Design a protein around this ligand. Sequence first.
Ligand SMILES: CCCCCCCCCCCCCCCCC(=O)OC[C@H](COP(=O)(O)OCCN)OC(=O)CCCCCCCCCCC
Ligand SMILES: CCCCCCCCCCCC(=O)OC[C@@H](COP(=O)(O)OCCN)OC(=O)CCCCCCCCCCC
Ligand SMILES: CC(C)CCC[C@@H](C)[C@H]1CC[C@H]2[C@@H]3CC=C4C[C@@H](O)CC[C@]4(C)[C@H]3CC[C@]12C
Ligand SMILES: NCC1(CC(=O)O)CCCCC1
Ligand SMILES: [Ca+2]
Ligand SMILES: [Ca+2]
Ligand SMILES: [Ca+2]
Ligand code: NA
Lengths: 376, 220, 132, 194, 21, 133
Amino acid sequence: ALVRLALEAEKVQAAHQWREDFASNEVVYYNAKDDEPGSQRIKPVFIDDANFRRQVSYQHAAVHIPTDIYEGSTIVLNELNWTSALDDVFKKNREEDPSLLWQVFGSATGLARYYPASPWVDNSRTPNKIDLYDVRRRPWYIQGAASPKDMLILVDVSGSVSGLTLKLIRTSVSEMLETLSDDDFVNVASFNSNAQDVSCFQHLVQANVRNKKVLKDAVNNITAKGITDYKKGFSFAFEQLLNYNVSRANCNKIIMLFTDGGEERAQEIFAKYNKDKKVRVFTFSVGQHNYDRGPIQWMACENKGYYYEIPSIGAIRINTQEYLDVLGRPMVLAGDKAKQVQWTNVYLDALELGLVITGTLPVFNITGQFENKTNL
Amino acid sequence: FPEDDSNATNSNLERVEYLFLIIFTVEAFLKVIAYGLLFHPNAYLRNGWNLLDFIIVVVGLFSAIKALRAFRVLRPLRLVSGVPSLQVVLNSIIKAMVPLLHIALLVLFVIIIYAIIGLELFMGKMHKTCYNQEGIADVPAEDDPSPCALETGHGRQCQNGTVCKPGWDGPKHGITNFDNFAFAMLTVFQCITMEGWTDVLYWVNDAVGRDWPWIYFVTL
Amino acid sequence: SITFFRLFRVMRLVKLLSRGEGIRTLLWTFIKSFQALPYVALLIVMLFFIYAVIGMQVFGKIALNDTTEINRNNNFQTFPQAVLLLFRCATGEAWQDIMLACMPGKKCAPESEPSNSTEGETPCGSSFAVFY
Amino acid sequence: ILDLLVVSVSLISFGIQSSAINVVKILRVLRVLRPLRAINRAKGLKHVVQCVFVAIRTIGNIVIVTTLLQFMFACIGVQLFKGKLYTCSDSSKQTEAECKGNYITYKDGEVDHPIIQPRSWENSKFDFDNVLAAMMALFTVSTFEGWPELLYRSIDSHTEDKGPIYNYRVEISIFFIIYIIIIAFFMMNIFVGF
Amino acid sequence: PDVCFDNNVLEDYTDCGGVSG
Amino acid sequence: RYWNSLSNLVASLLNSVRSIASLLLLLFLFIIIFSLLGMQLFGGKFNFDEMQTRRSTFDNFPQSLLTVFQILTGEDWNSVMYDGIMAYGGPSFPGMLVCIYFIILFICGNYILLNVFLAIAVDNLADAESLTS
Ligand SMILES: CCCCCCCCCCCCCCCCC(=O)OC[C@H](COP(=O)(O)OCCN)OC(=O)CCCCCCCCCCC
Ligand SMILES: CCCCCCCCCCCC(=O)OC[C@@H](COP(=O)(O)OCCN)OC(=O)CCCCCCCCCCC
Ligand SMILES: CC(C)CCC[C@@H](C)[C@H]1CC[C@H]2[C@@H]3CC=C4C[C@@H](O)CC[C@]4(C)[C@H]3CC[C@]12C
Ligand SMILES: NCC1(CC(=O)O)CCCCC1
Ligand SMILES: [Ca+2]
Ligand SMILES: [Ca+2]
Ligand SMILES: [Ca+2]
Ligand code: NA
């Protein structure tokens, strides 16, 4: 079922014409979590079913759009326009196996289109019932968006980071740790004229619930003081990634620096520990300040990494889950041999269904494949 | 920087501080040797000598192992001594300021009297808030509710579960209040410059009522 | 409940003002400058009176609200409160915020004759308030 | 004007609903000038009103040149900040075409307290677009009231229809400073004339 | 797991987050 | 300039500027000294609250100059005084004397500013006396 869905989705997206005239012609779809120009809504019938412990309809597929994503933009409109072709294959899949549970396509733009149609979840409309669901952060999405990694979070705890930016750094580190799974290994270090571990681990750990809790509790107790020294910190980070005496993953050695700014590039350390660019370096500039952000971007660009800015709590959610786009380039380039179904851990369904396991298969973009034009 | 940081530029300034200190020290030594028993009467010479001995002391203390660097800010004033036709302006300004002593003393007496009046009228009537459950108010808490439903009828705690709860630090951060003597004098000085006195008047009105403090504020 | 008498004690400090000589004659000759003072004072209080009256006439329909520059202590209907507001504006305490608080779109309380606000239009327009 | 007061006394009920309510009840405030007219013979009018009129007449060119400089600075500010002073609620969006939804704000901070609020595109209170406008803004700046807020709002503006940066174009603040000094050079001058 | 995908030589990676803005 | 009712006044203004450039540079030097003192004494201690960065700080030199100018104009100096007091702990015997700084910055310099206006009087004394030729 997953393979057929992925094939149909790729074929439909390949032959699609971009447009910006959604005012004249509207996209018709049923939206969940409800009850604007360019969109028409659908009123379902919502019969009651015995398999799903709620009311569902077998005539169209519901769409969930997160709160911060406005459903009137042209990207979302095009997404709905070209994803409206998955309903027929959804119906065929459910007709083949009537015992089929939820089928879902989670887009990279934020919206998740699932079948059968059913209203989103709510708990008595209490004030503490805001919908913060984001399909791009669900583990069944992250496990198929990339491969296991060997992340080592390097945190700036120098004196120039005390204040709002230190709190932002702590929150960002917690949200970054929230994206990891059991197959990934992580450790957290800090540096202020001296690099040291933030907890009792001293090396990479399997990053399960207990270890992640320990790391979060250790990172929520750090203080800012002393001068900054990027050379010692990066030496420590590269040394901890060359252990091989412990259990590891050996799949993605990445260094995720959290800082504000500086004037040090430290070319010698990078030319010493990775001449062959075997370790990616992602860089984050956190808070509102007036420090130079040049060397940070140079570090992000020289190594096959990326550079991000997190100026407020609002951007933490989105600007900490974007590194999976960079880590997915080799998988896309491999292409056909990377179309393998993966099954995830046991977790509680967000639509009140119990304990479930989710199959996973990514979908590639193949527009202009027979002409080899863009490839960007 | 917040807590002892640097960017390789402050270190160079610290290094050149030694050169500046050496230049000033040798200049002072040669000048005092040339003058002998004459370096004393001139005030600017004594100021420069004080600056140099102070910077020697602070650099020695730093080499032994902080805020004394603030005295370096007194160095640019020496420039005024260096350039002529500028000290006469300061002398004229001082001469013009001299006959204002009576007015300054009268202002001091008035502010002292008003501070004492405020101390007598208000002692601790600005330490209550509409706390809901335990020492926390839903409002930003800067309000000054009624003193537990007494003769004063302002700042009523009728918000469906709000009490006086006399356990508050005070308005702002406990800085603007008529308790103690320094606080009252500072508040009177703040009100006499016509900056933010309306907020103080409103807080006092919420504390005790709008049938008394307005006379005090308008008279001030 | 009566503490007005204790305020007399600090008044003894006023005796210390009589000790000085230059300050005494300075204040004596300055307080003696009440010859042309009454006419100018009457002109100023007349200006305040007329401005307060016209303001309470046009800026009526009080809106008891917080964080809107129009509160229980900052009203525009009672004459002493209007005079206090004008005095505050003269002293220069966020008068531009007060001006912005009086704009054509400004919902105001139904405390007036429209007890249920059955008018649709906010009774605090004051299109010329800026000029005022 | 007493005749007008008569039309205020009479119960006027014309087709206009605002009859004898605000059209004429605001023109009846001219009742305090009657004592002035009565005491115009000596009393406090022989030299009080005359001196005020002479003083206000004798200023003239100073006021007109101050107004001319105000107009010039308003034009300069319009050419500088014509549409730059704009923002949105979440401050994470730049164009006006993208700030048309809802966003999460965490009360005052400390996380774990989400609050969903609509996105709105708003100007910087005191507008600077038209030359008819942007003069009351400079008047407020010259009165030393709220000018730091406008200064820090206009320091970090850029492009034409985009949101602000933290500290882009810090130097432009000197403009404001110059204006202030110029205004002072006239505000202290006028007193001297008197 | 044994299947790992990383470090492909045909990766562009010319679009970092700094030089593009 | 079709009228010439201000020619003597304009010439007097130009000469007065050329003469009181000394007063202007003295005021600028005073502002520089107090800005340096404020930057050294306070510096980056205005980030105690983890809510929002305050614009009026003493981090940089231009920022210190802007803050000193704002205080000199007298617009909203109480908030800066409160921030400075809260930087040194809170309301207490050692943590309250720093406000003395602000007091000086509000009086002596302001007095200097007033004296500047005094020079203008003398300038107009050169105009009215020139009115009778
Ligand atoms: C807690 C201990 C307090 C100890 C205080 C000791 C003070 C001794 C000297 C008394 C000085 C009191 C000054 C009170 C007047 C302040 C004032 O009234 O400030 C508002 C006004 C609104 O005007 P505005 O246009 O709206 O804005 C500003 C545009 N400039 O500004 C001014 O006139 C500034 C006048 C300051 C004169 C001070 C001269 C002191 C000379 C004595 C030195 C020995
Ligand atoms: C020419 C002006 C003279 C310069 C003054 C220098 C004298 C020494 C001042 C600093 C004293 C010192 O050794 O520094 C202690 C610090 C550190 O501790 P805190 O910062 O409190 O700790 C944060 C807790 N979270 O402050 C204090 O304890 C009280 C400081 C009291 C003196 C300042 C008064 C200002 C002078 C006004 C001049 C016009
Ligand atoms: C709808 C909003 C944008 C307002 C309408 C357009 C505004 C910006 C335009 C329309 C007409 C314009 C006015 C037309 C004529 C004059 C006379 C000139 O000597 C000074 C400027 C002034 C007074 C203009 C200022 C700007 C103005 C008021
Ligand atoms: N199983 C995926 C869900 C909930 C989840 O993301 O865990 C979302 C799409 C529709 C089915 C439910
Ligand atoms: Ca640093
Ligand atoms: Ca003032
Ligand atoms: Ca003010
Ligand atoms: Na698995």
